[PDB]
């Protein structure tokens, strides 16, 4: 939740949907424990790890493109130092506050 906040960098604040340093508005969050928790894990929701660089406030990226973790030339071909950034989620009824 704190990664949706101004002035921080991470796998979400810069690589999912950037938000500016000058928030105007509100932060609202319904309790998703009884709405968005399912047995076996909510692996439908997916997050990446990095992108090319920082985004701009409220930009859309539905593409799941493979980013270059290292500096080898993928040359349009996935492989060494060209890894999948997306990962799944495990949500369980025994999960803690964190």
């Amino acid at each position, epitope marked *: 939740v704190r990664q949706i906040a101004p002035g921080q960098t991470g796998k979400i604040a810069d690589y999912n949907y950037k938000l500016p340093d000058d928030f105007t508005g509100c932060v609202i969050a319904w309790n998703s424990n009884n709405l968005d928790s399912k047995v076996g894990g909510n*692996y439908n929701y997916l997050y990446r790890l990095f992108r090319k660089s920082n985004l701009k406030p409220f930009e859309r990226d539905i593409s*799941t493109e493979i980013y270059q973790a290292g500096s080898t030339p993928c040359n349009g071909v996935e492989g060494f130092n060209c890894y*999948f950034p997306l990962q799944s989620y495990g949500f369980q009824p025994t999960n803690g506050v964190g």
Partner: nanobody
Amino acid sequence: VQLVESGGGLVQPGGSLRLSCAASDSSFYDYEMSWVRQAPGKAQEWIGSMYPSGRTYINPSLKSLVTISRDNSKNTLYLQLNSLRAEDTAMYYCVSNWASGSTGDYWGQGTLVTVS
């Protein structure tokens, strides 16, 4: 009628099967057309997805079980089922825009599937 489904039927445990869905025009497939299943009892889940950027990334839990391909001659869409057990009763609908929540999905009639 602008979208149809073809293939499927009884699944002998350990046998192969064929399934399909169709569309109307090339602009209808633009930009996203993702496979999806449903199931009585078992939660609904999306089968396969083909993103318009050229890279296809199936769900990490469902990327090693289903092969997905597209044929635009009939607008058909090959789907295969392999080794269903008694715990996987699924009913298949061809519903688009599931990565948009329950505000962009299109509901029609579909077909009813029972797996014993």
